[PDB]
């Protein structure tokens, strides 16, 4: 099973949650290695679409503020973690249930869709501890949102709301949180009335070119990262935290 | 090859005040495309390529722009059709990559399908505020083609255009403008002054340089486009031979 | 410097164009005044690099007064160049290392606009204006905008822009992706610069690394970009056009 998500699948959808809700499910080293274990069966089981969500208040607060050989296996597993996603064969969707930080936003631009409630927020405060971006984000975020909106989120930090990034290119749709629920599973459970096969190879066309590209990119943040990681300045942004 | 206008049969296509405007023209039947009007859009865009205009235009008659492919079986069965279909598309496709004057949609109406698609590959788009977009592809259990998969994504953002793409969303003429695929949208009633007062303004520019600049953008653009093209095509055949698109 | 006042405090080096009363067009010395002036910048101890304009204007462009500089190689070899010259400007753009900030107070024409496309943000008063009419001059695009406005902006918007010479609101650019945020002209210098003082306290090394990450794999691309506008332009400035155009605009 999982301790830190809840997976279920029916009706052709799969639905991953984050399950850390007293942690604003921050995601710790148990999650990362559980979601990339959820997405391989994901990718082979019989569902069309694939769903991440948040438990609660928060879709997610990010990488848990939980040596040398430490930075190097963490940048190894963040680097096989994106893999994933880059390599995910069918349609994944977020869910964007409240807040948003960190890696849980960058992912999002290898997602095919995302919607979100009217009080999700994303924030990538990387450089305020002194780190640098990952998630393919140097690449594709510019490349989203343009250029001179991506480095306010990506260099300087600055958090948007579900209707700044619905604007940015980020975020599909947005809703009011009341209905939210509703009006996501409503949508999806009819995309997954759709032609299976057609999703799937509809996807492959749009994602195959790209991969060898977001493997090379992930690669080279994962690099700098690692670089980042073993710093002074990160270790006295973070411990300045 | 022509002097004011060029009979066709499924298209209007004439040039005055620099402006080549070539129309779809099968109004009973939306515009749909029919195999005689890929070939004869084919010889249109040709002939706008060498003729003395400095832009060219694409419209439809009536109350669609087009609405799309218009819904018999060769020696070697379904396959030879499919590989015949996807020849065809991508030579189609490829006239609109390679077009080298400025091309730009007139939308004054509903459009659905590849003649949505290949307004990725146009520089300038019009519409009129009753112009809808729609590309239902995986409905019909198809893939994308006219070079959306590629150009999509990058004009719109993923998430935008994967609604369009895979899940067969329906836009506005208003969505379409705010996601980057149109131009400006103009009231249905001021749509064909107010457009044509700017295409016959923009046509008093200094043609040589209007040619130039598009080739500067495009030029090195086409290889990558002729390769998605293929791609798609290639896709699309093997779609075409699946239970899901018959069934 | 003659034609720029280059600055530095709070960590951020300021390349303010000063031409006021030649609404800071762009003559020869001043293209040469800037590379400098960003040489200078790349190695100084700022973290943010901030281009401005001093009085109503940003910068009016290219000053048209460079067509009549005219050598003893004649027209051909001049137009050889400054093809060079404005290749290698450009490219000290798609180089500079640092989070490079445009404040955009006034209006903004030609490859002082084209060249926002290489900026990391660009924040504009609301009296901003942005057009590069290249196609009314008998020119074409430079500044990497042939590449960059397109995928910046889409190219149903780039198209009017920088075929058609459509002018801009600052809302408008901010819209199509060209401007960061857009602020009122009363509260503009006050919003921008406590925002950009905020920004210089940021750790040094992550702003400067979180640049590199982004930027550093397409540079090779945009100098092929510059490098194939450069050589048209080379074409374009010696076409009937071109020189029709310059003799009009010479007379306003």
């Given at each position: ?5 809840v ?58 503020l ?25 349609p ?59 480095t ?5 930090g ?14 599909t ?69």
């Amino acid at each position: 099973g999982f301790e830190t998500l809840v997976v279920t699948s029916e009706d052709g959808i799969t639905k991953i949650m984050f399950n850390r809700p007293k942690k604003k499910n921050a995601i710790n080293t148990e999650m990362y290695h559980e979601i990339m274990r959820a997405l391989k069966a994901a990718s082979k089981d019989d569902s069309i679409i694939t769903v991440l969500t948040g438990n609660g208040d928060y879709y997610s607060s990010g990488n848990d503020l939980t040596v040398e050989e430490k930075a190097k296996n963490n940048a190894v597993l963040l680097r096989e973690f994106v893999g994933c996603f880059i390599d995910f064969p069918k349609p994944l969707i977020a869910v964007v249930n409240g807040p948003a930080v960190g890696i849980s936003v960058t992912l999002l631009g290898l997602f095919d869709a995302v919607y979100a409630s009217d009080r999700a927020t994303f924030h990538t405060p990387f450089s305020h501890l002194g780190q640098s971006p990952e998630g393919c984000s140097s690449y594709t975020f510019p490349k989203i949102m343009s250029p001179a909106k991506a480095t306010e989120m990506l260099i300087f930090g600055k958090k948007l709301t579900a209707g700044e990034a619905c604007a940015q290119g980020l975020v599909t749709e947005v809703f009011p949180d009341s209905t939210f629920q509703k009006e996501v599973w409503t949508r999806l459970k009819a995309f997954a009335k759709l032609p299976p096969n057609a999703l799937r190879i509809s996807k492959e066309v749009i994602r195959k070119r790209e991969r060898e590209k977001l493997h090379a990119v992930n690669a080279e943040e994962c690099n700098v990262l690692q670089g980042r990681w073993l710093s002074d300045e990160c270790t006295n942004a973070v411990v300045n935290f």
